[PDB]
Amino acid sequence: LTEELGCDEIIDRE
Amino acid sequence: EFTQSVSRLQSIVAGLKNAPSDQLINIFESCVRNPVENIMKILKGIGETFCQHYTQSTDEQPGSHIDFAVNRLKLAEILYYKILETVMVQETRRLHGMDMSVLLEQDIFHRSLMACCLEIVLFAYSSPRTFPWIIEVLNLQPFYFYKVIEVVIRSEEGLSRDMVKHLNSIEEQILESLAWSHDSALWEALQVSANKVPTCEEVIFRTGSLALFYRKVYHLASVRLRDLCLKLDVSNELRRKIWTCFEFTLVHCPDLMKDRHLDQLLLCAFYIMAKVTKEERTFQEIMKSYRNQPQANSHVYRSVLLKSEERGDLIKFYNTIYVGRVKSFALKYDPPLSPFPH
Structure with a gap:
């Protein structure tokens, strides 16, 4: 079962 | 000269x-x-x-x-x-x-x-x-x-x-x-107080070094939260729920602060209570605005302690650590709010 509050975003300027 | x-x-x-x-x-x-x-x-x-x-x-x-x-x-x-x-x-x-x-x-x-x-x-x-x-x-x-x-x-x-x-x-x-830090006398001071961390109400409005310390910590974090909520245009009612989640993590999750940064707990309080109340802001939205704050530097959201010694980004910390420790509290808002300073 999925947990909604999780975040699936990403970033990597460095 | x-x-x-x-x-x-x-x-x-x-x-x-x-x-x-x-x-x-x-x-x-x-x-x-x-x-x-x-x-x-x-x-x-x-x-x-x-x-x-x-x-x-x-x-x-x-x-x-x-x-x-x-x-x-x-x-x-x-x-x-x-x-x-x-x-x-x-x-x-x-x-x-x-x-x-x-x-x-x-x-x-x-x-x-x-x-x-x-x-x-x-x-x-x-x-x-x-x-x-x-x-x-x-x-x-x-x-x-x-x-x-x-x-x-x-x-x-x-x-x-x-x-x-x-x-x-x-x-x-x-x-x-x-x-x-893990060898701060703060942990000794908490220990002698039965690890009861002072709440905002007990210090903004009991006494001692722990009380003074947390009243300065609540003051500093309230000020930083006001600016982030203004630069992302959020309701004053979400701010009070973010503050209440922040306070929940400082009082009932104090171990999360050990060897970490105040701002790392404040941003993940911003995301989880943005999402649960449906006034959503992406964790990238929160972070970009944070970068304009004077104390901010990239390491706060790029180098976050995960185990004790592995490091990762704030999103990694949120998913691996934060959500499990805090979701039971935040989902009470999907209620008692806490006094926001000045």
């Missing part, structure tokens, strides 16, 4: 000696236990340690000459006697005629005051010996040292705006991270 900062310190110390004034020796002499010899022993120990470290070559900092060290120490000693006199003269016990032997025999106050006048002298000269150099050299706990800063700022009105901004900045570094 002197810098503004250096000219200000030599104005403050002008014609004062690196000794107690006759007024301070009077106050010392009124005490059942005259503290003058133990104050002088503290200042000599700090002086020897300071000079040993200043003159010893490391590869992080080439060492310097004994003549410069003694100059800095003497200027700091004059600052120490001058501020100690102002503090002791303005003490309510002195004005009520009460023995001050207990107040003057607190070693941690004298060491903290002298370290803080060394910090003022080294800052004035643009020294590379950066806080936290002085407290590391002198073995001073950040959790104890910080309390001195506001005493010094309200006791020495000759301090320049740059000096007061420097001291305010070191105070914030301690509240944000240094006091939360």
